[PDB]
Amino acid sequence: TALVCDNGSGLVKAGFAGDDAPRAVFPSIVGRPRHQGVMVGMGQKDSYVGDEAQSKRGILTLKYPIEHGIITNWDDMEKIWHHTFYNELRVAPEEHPTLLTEAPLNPKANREKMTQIMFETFNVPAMYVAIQAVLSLYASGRTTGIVLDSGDGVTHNVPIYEGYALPHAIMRLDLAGRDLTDYLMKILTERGYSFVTTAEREIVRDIKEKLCYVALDFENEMATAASSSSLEKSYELPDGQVITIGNERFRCPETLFQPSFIGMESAGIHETTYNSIMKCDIDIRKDLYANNVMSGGTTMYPGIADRMQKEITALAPSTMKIKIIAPPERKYSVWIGGSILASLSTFQQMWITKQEYDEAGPSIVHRKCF
Amino acid sequence: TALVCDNGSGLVKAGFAGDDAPRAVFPSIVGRPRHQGVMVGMGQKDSYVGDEAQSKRGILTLKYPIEHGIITNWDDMEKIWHHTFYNELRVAPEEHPTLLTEAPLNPKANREKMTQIMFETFNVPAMYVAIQAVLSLYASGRTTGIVLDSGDGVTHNVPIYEGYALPHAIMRLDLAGRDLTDYLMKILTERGYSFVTTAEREIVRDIKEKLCYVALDFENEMATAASSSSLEKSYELPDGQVITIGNERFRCPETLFQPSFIGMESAGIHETTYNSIMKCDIDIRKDLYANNVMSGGTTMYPGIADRMQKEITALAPSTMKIKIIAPPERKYSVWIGGSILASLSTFQQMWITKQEYDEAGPSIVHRKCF
Amino acid sequence: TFRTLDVDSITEPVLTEQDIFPIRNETAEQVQAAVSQLIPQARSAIQTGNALQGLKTLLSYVPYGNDVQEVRTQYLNAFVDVLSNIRAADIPAFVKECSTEEIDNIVNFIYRGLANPQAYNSSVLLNWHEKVVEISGIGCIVRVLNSRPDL
Amino acid sequence: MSNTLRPYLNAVRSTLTASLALEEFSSEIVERQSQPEVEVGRSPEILLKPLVVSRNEQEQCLIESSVNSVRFSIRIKQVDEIERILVRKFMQFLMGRAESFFILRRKPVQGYDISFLITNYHTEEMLKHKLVDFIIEFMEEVDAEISEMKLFLNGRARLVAETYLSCF
C-alpha cells in the first residue's frame, strides 16, 4: 500500500491507494488562539489543525497555509501533514510511499519544498507528485477528455488525447471556492448581515455549500428572484438567529461564468474550457468536446453541469455533440484517481525513491514527476 | 500465389496475384507522437504506420517516406514493408515471391536498395520490379498505347507499341497529387482557412478528393465562379466547423495543366503527353493517339478525361482520332495490372530468384527488369 | 567418487513398454508380407484416380513394432502419398464416415508424417489435421498421446 | 501475424490443449517428493508419447507430456545469420526472465530455440486456456518481433554511416 495525500487548498483529502474513497477529509486550516488564556491547565494547545480547529473557531484566527494551490506558509503546512499522517490516518509515514498532487503551472520551488519536506521531515520511503487534472481523468474511467478541476483556490483545464497531454493548451485560472466565499461575504453585506472574521468566513462557506446553486439563465433568474418568493430561503446560525437570502444564492456561483463580478479580467469557466479545446490540434477537438470532465468541490453546485453544457454548446459549432461528465463523487475525483494510479503495477517503477533523492537532491522531482 | 505491391508514393496497394483488386490499401505514412504521455497503463507505442497513424493523427507528426516516387527515408519504408507483410496481408515474406512496382527514370540506387532489402532483410524467395506504367497496359488489356500515370508523388508517360516500349520517348514529371495538396493548402489561405500541420495536410488531401474537379476551360470557369455561388461547395472539418470553397475547387487540379501555378517550368500533362507521342516513331503515333490510357489516383478528378481529350485534340493533327481510355477502376490499375502480370504462365521464368541474386549482388535487377 | 555410480538400474529393474502395451503376436516377416501386399493397392488407387478408396484400403491394416522400421517407413510413405492425392473438398465426406478406430489410425500417422518434414510435405498433413480434429473432436488427439510408442 | 501460420498453430493449439491434462503426482522412485515426471523420465508408464508438430525443416514444435507435467520446445524461423544471432540472444532475455513467466525453462532442450515446462501447479493456479493462448500468441508474434529488430539494426547501421561520412 501507498498513501494518497491530495493536500488541496481548502480540504486535505487523504487515505490509502486502492481504498474506495478518502478516509481523512478535513479543512486545510491551522488555527491559533487570539484571546487571554486565563484558566491554567485545561488541556490548552498553542495551535489546532483541521476539524480540531474548525470546531474551536470562535476563539481562533483560522488561516490556510496554502493559497491558490501554492504553499504560502511551510511551518503550518508541515503541521497539516503531521496531523494527516499521525492523527488522522494514524500511520508512520516512514513506512509508506506518498502520492502527492499539485495543480499545473505552479512555481518550481513549491514542488521542490514539497518533496524535500516529505523526504527530510516525514522521512517517507518513496514519493510522487501527480498533476491534479491528470488524476481526475483516471477517476472518470477515460484516457481522453478535458478535465475542468476546480477546488477552493484554483480552477484549471488539462486536455488529454490517447493519454498524451497537450501542455501548450493547459489553462489555469486563480478563481475557485474561496473567491466565491469572499464574494458571498461582499454580497451578504448588502442584505443586512455582516461577516468579517476568519471564523465567520467558515459560516458563509457553510451557507455557500448548501443554499447556493447555478442558474441555467442568469438574466431571467435575476428577474424571477426580483418578483417572487420561491427563490428565497433561510439558514440558522450558530447564534440561533436566521439568515434569509434570495438572488445572492445564484449571483455567488455566477462569478465562475462571469469573473468580472470580483474585478477579474478573464474568460469564465465555460469560455476557458473552449479556449483550451480550441488550442488543441484540429483532429482531437471532437473527442475533447464529447468528454469534458467536471472535478473538485467548486463543481458541486446544483445545475452547473446543465449550465456548463448550455454555455459550451453556444461557443462550440452546432454540428457536433457536447457532453459534460459530472459524477456524484466528483467531490473527491482527484483523490479517487490518485488511488487508482498509486495501485497500477507500472506506477511502482515511477516513484522518486529515498536513495535516489539522497543522491540526486530535491531537483529530482523536475526530471521524474513530469 | 505471388504477392504484388504497388508501393505508391502516397497509398500502399498490396495483395496476391489473381485477385481482382488490392487486399490492403492504406496511406504510405509513418507517424511518431509529438506530445508527452501522462497516462500510465495506456499502450504507448513509439511509431504508428498506415491506417493507425492516419486514425491517431491529432497527436502525431506524420512523414511520408517516399518523395516523388523515390524512397527517401529507408527506415520508415522498412516499417511500411513490415506492416504490409506481418500486419496487413499477415503472411510471412519468405513464403511468396513478390512483384514490386517502380516509376520510370528513378535513381538506379532506389531499385538496387529495394532489391537488397527484400533479399537480405525480408529474405523473400524471388522478386521483380516492374515499371508502373507498363502494368497499366496489362490492366487496360492493351499491347499498344501511351500510358498517362499520375499518383501522389509522380506523373509519367510510357509509350508502348505491340509490347515494345520506347524508352527514349518516356516523359516524367515530379508533379502529382502531393503538390496539389501543397498548393490547395496555400490557396485555401486566400479565403482565410489556415492549414499548416502534417495532420491538417490530411484534411486538405480529403477536401481535394471530395470536392475538386478539372474545369473544361479555365478562363471561362473562372469568369463563371467570379459572378456566382453556384460552383461553391462546403466541407465539415473533423472539428465540426464548415469551410466553404470557391474557384480554388478547380484552380487546384489546373496545376496539372499549368505547372507555372506552383512556380515550376514544365509542360502540363497535355503537352507532356503530346511531346511523348511526337518523340515516338511517325508510324506508331496514329495508334498512340487512339489508345491513350490513364492511371493513378490524380487522374480521378471529374472532367479530367474531357479536359485531356480537348487539349490533345487542340495539339494533335485534326485529321485523326484522339481517344482516351480512362477506365472506372483506374485508381488501382497499376496493382490490377501487376496482379495479371504476376499470374501469367510466361512470367514465372522472369523473377529474380534468391539463388540468382546472391551470385550477382543487387546489380542483377538492371539486367532482368526494364 | 561414489555419489555418481547408479545402482537403481542394476538392483530395481524398471518396467518396459511391452509390460504396459501387449507385445505384437504377428512375426516380423508375417507383417512385412501383410504390408507389402497392401502398398500396391494404395499405389494403384492413385494411378486410377480413386485415391480415397486407396486410403480406405491402406488404413485396413497398420504395422507396429521396434522390429519393423524398414516397413513402417514404407507404410508411412504410401500414407503421406495417398493424403497428398485426395482433394481438400472430399476430406469432410471421408472423415465423417470413418470409424473412431480408423480416425485414430489417420491422426496417429499424420503425427508421424509431421515428425519428418525433410521427407514429407507438412502443408497437406496440417490441412488433414485441422479437418480430422474439427469433425471428430479433440479426444482423437488424446488417443494419439496415449497410443502405443512403437506405432 | 497469422494467415501463413494458421494451419500450423491450429495443429499446435489442438495438440497442446489435448496434452495439458495434468494432475498431482507423488514420485514413485523417491518418497515424500513430487517431481515433474516429463523432465526426470525415470518411470516410463506415466510418460505419454512425444509428438512433433511441424511446418517446415526449420519451424517445429516438440510436445512431451506426463501425468503431472508437459514440456514444449520450439524451433523458430532463422533464415540468415542476422536472425540466428537476433533469435539466439532474444531467447536468452526471454528465458533470463523465467522466474516471472512461470511456465518457461531457463535452458532449451538440445537443438531447440526456446522451451516451456507447464507443470501441474501452473494448471491449478493459472488459467490453462490462457497458457495455450500465450504459447500460440508468442509463436505468431516472435517472427514479427525479430524481423523488426533487423530493421532497427539497419537503421543504426545508417545512423553511424551518415554521422561518420558527413564530417569530411
Next chain:
Amino acid sequence: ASFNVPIIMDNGTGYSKLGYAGNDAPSYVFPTVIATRSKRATEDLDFFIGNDALKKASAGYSLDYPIRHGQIENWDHMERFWQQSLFKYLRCEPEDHYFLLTEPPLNPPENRENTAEIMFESFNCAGLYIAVQAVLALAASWTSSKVTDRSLTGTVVDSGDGVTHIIPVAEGYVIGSSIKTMPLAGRDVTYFVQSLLRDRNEPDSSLKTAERIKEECCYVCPDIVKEFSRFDREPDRYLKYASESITGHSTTIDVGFERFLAPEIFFNPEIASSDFLTPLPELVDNVVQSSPIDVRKGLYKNIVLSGGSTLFKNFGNRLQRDLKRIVDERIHRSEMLSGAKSGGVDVNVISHKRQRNAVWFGGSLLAQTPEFGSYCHTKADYEEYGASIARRYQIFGNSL
C-alpha cells in the same frame, strides 16, 4: 593464449578502478556512475560515465549508480558503462586481451552469468577471470611480487563504498566456509553524515558534501559516550567546513558529533541497520574462530585492511584493540580453567601504502603470473558451454 597485458577492472559501488596488469597505479579511478536521458533512436549513445558524468547533472541527464551493495543490479547501465570504459578510456580491443573483473564473495551466480555473456557476446573478449575482490587485496600487502616477500596467510578486511567483507585466506587458499559479509560501508556512512547535516538543517546536505566531510573531518574514537562528553569540554572539535553549492556560491557547515559517530557505523552497525547487528571486531573474531584451528595464530598475526572506507583516522588501532580485547579475554578464560599460563596470540591489523585500491593492485600483481591465461574462462570454453561456465562459485564449497 594472447601475450598482451591483461586488463584489470575493479568496478566498485563507489569507484571503478581501471588499468593494465603490471602498472604502478590504476589508469583511472572514477565514480561507478552513468549519466542518461530522463528521427533515429540514439538515447543509448548519448550517455557519459565517471568524472565526465558528474559534469552532466546540470545539463539535464539523470545520474544512476549501476552497482549497489557491491553487486551489479542494472545490466543495461553496466553494459554501457563497460563499453564506454573499454572503447573511450582504456581504448583497447577486447579480442586481444584477457580481462580481470572483480565481485564480492556473496554475489549471486546470475551476476557472474550476466557478466560472462556481456563480456563474451557483446565485447567478444579473449578470456575472463572474475576474481573475489578481497582475495586479491591480500596481494597488495606484499613488499614485492617476488616469492620471498609473500605472506600467503592472513585475514583480509575489505570495506569499500557499498560492501564490507572479511575473507580469511591461509597458505594461499581461501577458507570459503568462514567468509563474513555486511552490506554497510562508505555510502551508508555517507547517508548517515548527510542525515545528521539535514537534522541540524545546515545550508547544504548534498551527497558530495557528506562524501567530502567523511574523508576531510571524520575519525574513529575509542568510545562515543566519552567522545560526546569531550565535544562539550573541548569546543575546538566542532570544525567549520566551507562547501560550494551545486549552483556556484559559498556556504559554511558546522560539523559536529558526526566527526566520530559516523565512522562508528562499523563498530556499532545497529546505528545503520536493524538486520546487521554484529560489529566489525566481533565479525572478525567470528571469522577467525570459525576457521580451522592450526591457521588461527596466522590469521590473527596478519589482518590486512583494504578498500577506501578503512582509511578513517584511527580505524586500524580501534579494530586492533577491540579484537585484542575479545581475543585475550577468551584466552584468559582458558588460562583460568587450566591454572597454567599461555604464550597468548599477537594480533596485528595492517594498514599499508596501497590500502586505498588494494583489490586493483592485487589483481594487477596476480595477472602478471605466466599461469594466469589458464585460470581465465577462454572464449573457446564460452563457445562450447555458454555463459553457465561462470555460474559455479570458485570460493564456497559446492555440492556436485
Next chain:
Amino acid sequence: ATSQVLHILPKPSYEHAFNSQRTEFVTTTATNQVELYEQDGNGWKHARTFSDHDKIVTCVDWAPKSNRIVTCSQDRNAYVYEKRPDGTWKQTLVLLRLNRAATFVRWSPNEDKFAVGSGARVISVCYFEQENDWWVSKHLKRPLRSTILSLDWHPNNVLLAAGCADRKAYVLSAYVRDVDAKPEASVWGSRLPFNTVCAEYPSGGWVHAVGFSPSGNALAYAGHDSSVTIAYPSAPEQPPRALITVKLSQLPLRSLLWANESAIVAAGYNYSPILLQGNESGWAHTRDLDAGTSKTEGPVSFTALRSTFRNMDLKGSSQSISSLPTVHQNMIATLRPYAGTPGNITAFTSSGTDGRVVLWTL
C-alpha cells in the same frame, strides 16, 4: 439436470465428502490442511482445519453410518478422525507401512475397514482391532505394477476394484478374516481369499476411475485415453460376457458414478459431467449434464475503474478475460453420490481443481 454451486473454495479441491446429514463437508485443499465446512443458512462456513499431515493431502473420505473421516497424504500416513462428545475431532495415526505416497482412500460399505491406494505398487486395506485399539494394514500387492489412481468397493464388503497407471483395472478380493462375514458366491467368484484376482481388465490409457454397478454384476472404468469401458464378468477363469468400450470425443474422464443399473455419469478434464446409458448389449454417451455444452449502460463501480486500468497495465487491454461456458473453470477432480436410494442416484456432487463444490440433480 440442474447445477447449483454450493461453495467456492480458495484453493484446488481434489476430494471432498459430505456427512450423512449433508449438513457439513470435509475437503482437501492442495496443502497439508483439510478444511471442514458447515451450513450457514443457504451458505457454507469454514468450521475447522485438520492439519496432522506432514505433506500435501491427496484424498479424504467420510463414513456414512459410523461418522468417521479418513485422510491420505504424500507423507505416506493416514489419519482417522472420530467425533469426541465435546464436539471436536480425535485424530488417530494409521500405520499404513507404505514405502511411497498414499494417493486415494475409501471406506468399505460396512465401514469396518478402509482401503488406501499408493505409489508404492500396493494397496493398504486397513481394519481396527478392539483387542489392541490399533488400526492394522494388509497389503494387496501381487498383480499391481504401478501407482494406484482410484479405488471402489463392491456393495458386498469383500471385492475391491483398483485403477492402476499400468493401463489396467484390477478386481481384487480384500476379504479380511475376523472382520468380514463370508462372501456370497457371485459373478466375480466364490473361492475368494485375500488378494485373489477376479480380473486384470485392459485400457488404452491410465485408469483414472472405477466403480461397480449398484447390483455389483458389472464394473465400469475410465481411461486417460478419453474412453469409458463397462466390463460384464461371467465366472472365474472365464472371459467376460461383454467388454463395451465407448470412446468420447472430449478430454479425459477423471471420475465416474453409476446413476442406476443402466446409466453412468462421468466427469473430468472436459470440465463437465456427461451421462452414458446402456446395458450388456451396448452403451453410448447420451447427454451432457451442463447446459454449457451448448456454449451459452449505467453507473460504473470504483473496482471497475481500478480493474480496467490494472487490466490495461498488467494485461493487453481493458477487456475482461472470459469465463468458460461450463460451471467448472478447471478439471473436475471427483464425482460423488448425494441423494436418492442406493442404486438410483437422483443427485450427485463434484469438486474441482478450480475450488467449486457443485450439486447436480439429474
